């Protein structure tokens, strides 16, 4: 709906848009915003985008990634667990343990 403003002929609209994204609240704006995370890492950084997408669907999208970010699965950890599976005393050497 917005972003369609002053680009649409329907003359009344630019009364309900050019004067909608005009009030205090409702500051539209797609693109690439600053999300508190900004420079947090993973195996790539995280950018924040504001695609037009409904929010039920998007809240969900926010949830998987935001959560994945919070469950530090250090590989030393996968090894410790893997350690569990083999002739009691067997030595595992691999990636940094973090």
């Amino acid at each position: 709906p917005a972003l369609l403003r002053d680009f649409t002929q329907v003359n009344w609209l630019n009364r309900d848009i050019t004067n909608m994204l005009q009030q205090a609240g409702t500051k539209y704006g797609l693109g690439l915003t600053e999300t508190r995370l900004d420079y947090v890492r993973l195996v790539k950084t995280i950018v924040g985008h504001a695609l037009n997408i409904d929010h039920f669907a998007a809240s969900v999208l926010n949830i998987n990634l935001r959560a994945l970010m919070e469950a530090n699965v250090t590989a030393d950890d996968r090894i410790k667990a893997l350690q569990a599976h083999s002739m009691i005393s067997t030595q595992f050497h691999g990636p940094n343990q973090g």
């Binding site: 195996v43 893997l82 050497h93």
Partner: protein, 50 residues
């Protein structure tokens, strides 16, 4: 500041053998940095973790 991904190229590996008694006459010591591996190749770290 990003993980490789591609396949960069490294300085050739000259293998140092170091046998019980070895004789040390480095007269061809190639100048450009090189990596010296004491054990014949053997890097052995193969057990992919899907």
């Amino acid at each position: 500041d990003d993980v490789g991904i591609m396949q960069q190229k490294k300085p050739p590996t000259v293998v140092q053998s170091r046998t019980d008694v070895f004789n040390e006459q480095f007269a061809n010591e190639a100048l450009h940095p090189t990596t010296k591996v004491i054990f014949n190749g053997l890097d052995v770290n193969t057990e992919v973790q899907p």
